[PDB]
Amino acid sequence: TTDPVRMYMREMGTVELLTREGEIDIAKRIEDGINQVQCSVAEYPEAITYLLEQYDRVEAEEARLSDLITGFVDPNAENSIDPELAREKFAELRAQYVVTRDTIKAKGRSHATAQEEILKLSEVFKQFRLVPKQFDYLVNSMRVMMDRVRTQERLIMKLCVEQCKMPKKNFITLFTGNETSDTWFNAAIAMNKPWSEKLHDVSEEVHRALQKLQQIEEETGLTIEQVKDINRRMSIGEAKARRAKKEMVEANLRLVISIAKKYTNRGLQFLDLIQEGNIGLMKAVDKFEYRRGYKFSTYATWWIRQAITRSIADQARTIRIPVHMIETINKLNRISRQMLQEMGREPTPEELAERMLMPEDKIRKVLKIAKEPISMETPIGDDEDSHLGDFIEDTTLELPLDSATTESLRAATHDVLAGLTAREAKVLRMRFGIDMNTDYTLEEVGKQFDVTRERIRQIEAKALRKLRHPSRSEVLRSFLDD
Amino acid sequence: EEFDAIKIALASPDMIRSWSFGEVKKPETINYRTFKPERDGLFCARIFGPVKDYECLCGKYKRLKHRGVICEKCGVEVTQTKVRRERMGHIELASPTAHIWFLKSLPSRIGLLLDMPLRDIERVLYFESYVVIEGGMTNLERQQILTEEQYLDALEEFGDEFDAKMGAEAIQALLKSMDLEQECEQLREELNETNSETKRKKLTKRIKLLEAFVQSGNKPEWMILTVLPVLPPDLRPLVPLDGGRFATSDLNDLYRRVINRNNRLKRLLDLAAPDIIVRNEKRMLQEAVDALLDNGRRGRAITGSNKRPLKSLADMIKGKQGRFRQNLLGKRVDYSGRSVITVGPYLRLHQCGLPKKMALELFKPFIYGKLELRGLATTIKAAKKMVEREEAVVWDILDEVIREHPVLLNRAPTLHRLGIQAFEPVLIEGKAIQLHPLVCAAYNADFDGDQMAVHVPLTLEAQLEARALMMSTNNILSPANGEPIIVPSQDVVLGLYYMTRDCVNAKGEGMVLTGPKEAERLYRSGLASLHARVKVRITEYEKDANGELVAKTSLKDTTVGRAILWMIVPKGLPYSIVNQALGKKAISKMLNTCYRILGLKPTVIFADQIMYTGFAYAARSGASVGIDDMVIPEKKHEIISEAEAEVAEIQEQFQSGLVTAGERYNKVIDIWAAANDRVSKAMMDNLQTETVINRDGQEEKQVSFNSIYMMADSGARGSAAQIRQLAGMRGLMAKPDGSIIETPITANFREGLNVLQYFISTHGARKGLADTALKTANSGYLTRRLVDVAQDLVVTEDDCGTHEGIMMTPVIEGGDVKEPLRDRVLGRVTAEDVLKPGTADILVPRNTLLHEQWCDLLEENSVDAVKVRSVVSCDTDFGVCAHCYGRDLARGHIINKGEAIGVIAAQSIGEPGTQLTMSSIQVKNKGSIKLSNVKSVVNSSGKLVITSRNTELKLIDEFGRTKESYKVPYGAVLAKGDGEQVAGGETVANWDPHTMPVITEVSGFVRFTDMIDGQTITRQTDELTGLSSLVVLDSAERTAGGKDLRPALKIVDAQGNDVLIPGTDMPAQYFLPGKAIVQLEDGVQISSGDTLARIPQGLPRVADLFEARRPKEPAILAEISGIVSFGKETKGKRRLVITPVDGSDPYEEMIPKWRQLNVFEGERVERGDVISDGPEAPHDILRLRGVHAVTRYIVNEVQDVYRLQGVKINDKHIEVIVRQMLRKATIVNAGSSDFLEGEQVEYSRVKIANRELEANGKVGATYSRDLLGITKASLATESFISAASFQETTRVLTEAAVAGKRDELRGLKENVIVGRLIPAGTGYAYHQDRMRRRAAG
Ligand SMILES: [Mg+2]
């Protein structure tokens, strides 16, 4: 089968629909992993440098209830934000952090008391569920800083291993065992490798690439072992949701292909509407709250629906209609039919315009614009004799008699102007831009010949009487009728 | 200018980058309102260029002040426009895509490279699963699909050493990986060790292929795409219409599709999406690519809401609507016209009408320039307004300009050259074009609503060609055949035929004239009869001496019309010319003779005066028709009463339950036929001389004035069949079946038709009409395919100094001589000294132009075969010699180099081909008899009977010519032995229709042997008589039990032995075939001459002869000599174990044994001898016989088919078109080149002109000749341009580009398609200038 519709419907035909807790379980695994990446935020180097500074940054502009704070907290009840309750819920969070931290220093990082207090910092957290963009950038400040260390891990590995040699089996147990000092070098080289003794002519840049790596630490102010731990702890915290959503999406594939193929009349096409519904479903998979307790298919039907209903507006036409005009046009192609009911005969646009609620000119204008274009390759000849492309005339370039007329005209003007005093002819030629790429002014017959200006007016007038002069005006007179 | 050749190789992505001027990223074209370009879409003005010239979008920098400036305000370069046609963009793709024509085309050029099959790679790339991109371990293979659950085994087994995943990149890396060199030199190194069988030839295939890519220079990486150019905007435009509607090329659709899918793939690859969608997007990207490349070939075509599919790039080069056939070869014309035509009876030859309206319209530039020259219209406003106002001077100056200003004339269809000519204008205010009536024939034009078209020679080479070459006065003979084209149309001939007539009845018998003056005084006074043989005086002349006229006078009792006419004759001829009643044959021969001796100019004025005079007095002659010019015969009721009684008897016979229908029905038709053929007699007797008009006597009758016999006698209109269908019965009538109705047309047009007779005629009318309307295509194809072959021939040596070539014998067969050898010899060189039937009477020293002194000297002689140094037999390499061609017909002398033809052949052959689709041996007269190469027998009765199928009877005259030629059944029964002499008009053979007798000249016992019930035979009683024997079924009806073995009832004696054929040691029994039913039983004895068995009973072929398709069903001529024997035994067809004397036996061919054979199971044939009753493939002739015999065979057959239709062409054409068949040289040996490589026979001669010469005695190889057809030779050509013009342009383009072809533009269509000159015609002088230059350093 050559069709991607059979292929695709057979391929979506593979996976089934998982319903009524696997939806909410996808949601719960998603939110869990999410909660653990924000845990990984809670145990930060310089990368974040936000958590509370962010809230002081959103309040610092003297008052805001705008886009960001509906990207911030937006807490679910397991609404217009009164800042009273905002300043209420942040106090205990700060208290929890400050009471946890001093014990994170007591006897160790995660001393048993310290670790139960990190657990308390976590149980206090999991009754929150919050969302987009700046929190995305917050974790991007960890993603790029992931790439600071891999960046150096690539640089020094390249500049060392690719000219030198070394084994691998020893390296992992040696590098992870200390990670901090070079005792593993003299322990690896405790034995031998006189090829290692060849270490000359490159020395000055090797521990200068190691300079670039080691400086990452003090930037971070944070130890390489905890770097390893919390980075893996965030990455798996991403992967959870990253693969958890696909279950929902594969379930409601048929939801999508159904909803889309409800509007696969000859509007645009099957697979494109199906794709747009798939976008709307993913919007649903991502946005759905199980805590509302509603069906997903309703929600996803909203998102699928709007997706297709406006993609068919943005797409599907060579002349890009915006939405507002389309909504007007919806009103009209609704109201016109009520009109011809009530009328019972043709509503030429005054027996149309009124009930539409808009005057005649809009109805008329839209009656004109509803002409989609008409496709040259159609056979306007009933026989295969004249595709429209053959009938088309091209009125853009020139007509040769016009070229000849213009040539004769300006040759005659050259022949007429050739016989004047030099000043008359020259001021005229240049002043009207004759025979160059300039637009000359009498300010410039001023600035160029002599700062006199009005005598140029009385020179032009004299030349015109010299040259209209109907012993000369008759090569001009055939051009009266132009 | 000068060129030799150049190299090509694949498109680098670096090359499309370099060529292109900026990436296109978007599908976006314009704004909804501000109809203006989009940045980085398809119409990116910043890439392809602006609209105006040397200006930036703001207009800062301009007019070459700021030449290489970019206006930094808009970042817009100050550059010019003709590059807008050039400047392309490009597109960088997400993932590699491949070119379909390196893929879907036959031998793939990528799959043949690797030699790994296709569907494997399809599923590698439909991604049935993971798939070995790289079987690092050859344990795993590339192109090897690995399932998600099987892949893991490859994984945990090797892990590292395999790449088994998805994509085109698999194939990319493959092409990049493989190395051609050392395979090549290795295969060579082990070629030398043992240059093996099929193994090594495919080693060798590869070795040469590999090295071909090596040394040719090629880069099969660029088989794969990474960069995609962007065709410029104006190569795919998008424009408005008056009503706001827009108009586009379909390409934009596919462009948008590809860019959108690519950008969505750029999205999906940033998200690490589930790669199933990346597979689907990859399939979709490759599909949109391949549809840009070829859309409607793959699957169901892509269509709009129209449901019509959309034209691709390829069709814009291909078939009709491509450039070539529609609008590069064949244009619409500037300054042309066309309209309805009528006659000019008072034209001179060079003249033509011109309604001065269109005179003015086409010639306005000349009259405008001339109104400015005189200065009345001082400007073009003035000239145009003056010429809209139609000044009086516009007329006189239109005449001034038009004086001596030729113009063309064109009617559709332009079959041959003379459908378009160039006359002088005659300005008229008659809206109908007038036309000199005699060129109605070359145009095939008759005035029933026709329109001609017109064309203007502006330039002076064209004007002067029109006046010297297309002119009405340089064209007086068909080059198809040297006949005049000045035939009397149908009226001047009727005129003359009336004038020079000789009655007896009118008046004025036997007085005297001193000459045609008082003949005109008399006849214009009204005294003599124009048609009355009356004594006059003549004074003819003759140029008996050395071009010196010789006066004389005499008297001749001749008609007033011949007399009065004779003065027109230009005083070089005798009076016997005019001394008959001037049949149009005479008129042909008149202007012939006139032209011949006189030169031409008399024949011109002469013919003009004869057109003039015949038209004049033919209007004075009177001609009409009346109801009584067809007849009411006196015997009309009696024939009816007789037919009435006859059919009454037929009725009563039908009543009996006897004659039942078929006998009755046929009887009825035959009697109707005879009855009204008697009516036809009655009526033609009751017109022609019924006028008894006494004159000075009792009574005398004379040809009456019917006018129908007269218009039937000249050749104007009508003939005996026309006049019967008006008079007698209209023969029989075949309904659409092809069978023949048995109850005819009885009445005629005068008497009155029946409804159904009429309706039966409508059928034949409609069938013939649909044949007419639907074969202009057939000639269309044959002609145009033949022309597309067209190359030339050029001479290089005065005489090649070579020996004989071709024989000349004339083409008399079937009827009389059809080309005198006098003509065939004419203008050619002799092969050799040639004698006379008085032998050893040499007349040439091996080579002479045999002009008609010789051809007449040898027409005088009855010498009957001469040979010619042929152009084929001319052995000058890369050309011929002049003597071998002989004479230039136009010059009438030995030809000069450079001018050459072959569409001339096409016109000559095709132009008539339009309509011209729509037992016994006798001698007729005295003479010797020269029949041979036949096995025949004096049968039991004592006359000749054929026993070898070959013979065809001929009716030979006393001089020796064939008068008739007819075919003869094998085993027939003649009453004549060849080499006797008979009175003509005799049934030489009275044959039995059903029986094909099986006579036994032997007298021996019969007994059933070799033949048994239900194996070879049935035994199945002859029911009517009642006696029987073993009954031999046909081929298919008997079971296959004994179909593998020949049934033969056997003759024996009392001993059982083979009753040997009397006179020889050969046994005599008959392998009985089907219908060979013996009637008397086993053990019965037969006698001498005794039957054991009784045996009861277009233009498409033109297509077949020209296209070189194989002959079809039956058995054929002996392929090879030596003993030949029978093979596998009738699986449908039995085979033939040939056993050549020293050659190879294994050849065996299925033959219909149903179609009886000639050579028996142990009889020998010579090669090229008939095996059966049927044709042979001509390829058998070329492969078996040489070149002369085969080409002779083809030209024989084809001109028989034409000559059948009343047809004539100088067959020089049919041989030159066969030189153009194919020149493929299949090498015999090897050593210099490959063993059987198709090479230029030219270059073959070159190598043997190098290696076989003392360089070696021989290291190389010899070579053979080949055929296989004309169209594939068109394909099989140096150039790909002439090859890539016509149908299946696609595959031709594939195979062209794959070599990176770089044609050198020498052939016709090659330089044509770029519009530059080619070797001859107008470019002849420049080409030979280059030739002398090549000779002169
Ligand atoms: Mg006609």
Ligand SMILES: [Zn+2]
């Ligand atoms: Zn600008």
Ligand SMILES: [Zn+2]
């Ligand atoms: Zn020759």
